[PDB]
């Protein structure tokens, strides 16, 4: 049982929409600390970790902590009815459905049946990332679209004063380069020259909900997974871990 209120329904809708393109179902943990959700896509190539602390909500009242199972495409469907001006309310009693309400010019309440979703659970492993890149969502989103013209895969290369994404196909190539002089490169910390490759299909889904001016943190290593995170209402966080393409 809970009542949780979030100002700006579309921003919340975008989160769920991104997640729904990677996973079909998720378990959402409503704790006193905030909402958390963790899942892998069925092929176990990508991990999603959503963390929305209670502080980003205008009201956060969890009378009884609870984990609820949700069909992501139907959650998306409903949340996409929210207008930018709408206040979002997520409310749950003892019954097995979630009440989603948009408060704006009218009060619009949807009832979503809840389902059984089995949580796999181990926490994030501590990985020895040798490169950290902070860049504008614009560059990331662009570069991924650029690369898809040419390949199904994109190579990330980090050296101490340059970050490059490159894709090659059949004669055609593209390289997207940032140096510390560039606007869109906010930070670059490199322990050792770092190279890994990733699938464009996954990347595309991952960055769809990212804003052009959002600050996105990339962490990766040589033939290691990519960790990608961006902030939600400052304290919230959506984190992806994406397994590499090797050879």
């Amino acid at each position: 049982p809970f009542e949780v209120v979030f100002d700006g329904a579309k921003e919340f809708a975008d989160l769920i929409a991104t997640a729904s393109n990677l996973i079909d179902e998720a378990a959402f943990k409503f704790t006193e600390e905030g909402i958390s959700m963790r899942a892998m896509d069925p092929s176990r190539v990508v991990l999603i970790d959503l963390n929305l602390p209670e502080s980003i909500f205008s009201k956060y009242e969890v009378e009884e902590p609870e984990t609820i199972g949700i069909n992501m495409d139907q959650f998306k469907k409903i949340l996409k009815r929210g207008k930018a001006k709408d206040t979002l309310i997520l409310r749950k009693g003892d019954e097995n459905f979630l009440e989603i309400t948009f408060e704006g010019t009218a009060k619009r309440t949807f009832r979503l049946p809840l389902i059984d979703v089995e949580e796999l659970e181990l926490e994030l492993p501590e990985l020895p990332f040798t490169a950290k890149v902070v860049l504008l969502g614009e560059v990331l989103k662009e570069g991924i679209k650029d690369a898809s013209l040419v390949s199904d895969a994109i190579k990330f290369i980090a050296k101490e004063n340059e970050f490059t994404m490159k894709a090659e196909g059949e004669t055609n190539e593209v390289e997207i380069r940032l140096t510390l002089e560039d606007e869109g490169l906010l930070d670059l910390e490199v322990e050792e020259e770092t190279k890994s490759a990733y699938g464009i299909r996954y990347l595309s889904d991952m960055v769809k909900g990212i804003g052009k001016a959002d600050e996105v943190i990339l962490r990766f290593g040589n033939e290691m997974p990519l960790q990608m995170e961006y902030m939600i209402r400052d304290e919230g966080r959506l984190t992806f871990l994406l397994a590499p393409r090797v050879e």
Binding site: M40, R44, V45, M224, A243, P244
Partner: peptide
């Protein structure tokens, strides 16, 4: 090859 995340769990 598209690795899975399993080796890292």
């Amino acid at each position: 090859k598209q690795r899975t995340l399993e080796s890292w769990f």
